[PDB]
């Protein structure tokens, strides 16, 4: 761990910290997406 050079072990830890933060990112987007949407339209509109 905590390696980023030529060596097989550094291909499987960068590989896997990968899948990981890639995962959770795309999670939380669509995840979260629909919570945007829930406090957008939370309160009524006020053009006045």
């Given at each position: 761990m905590?390696?980023?050079s030529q060596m097989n072990k550094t291909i499987?830890?960068?590989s896997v910290l990968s899948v990981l933060v890639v995962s959770?990112?795309?999670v939380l987007v669509?995840?979260?997406y629909?919570?945007?949407m829930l406090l957008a339209g939370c309160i009524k509109y006020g053009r006045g």
């Open positions: 905590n390696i980023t499987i830890g960068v959770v990112v795309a669509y995840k979260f629909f919570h945007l």
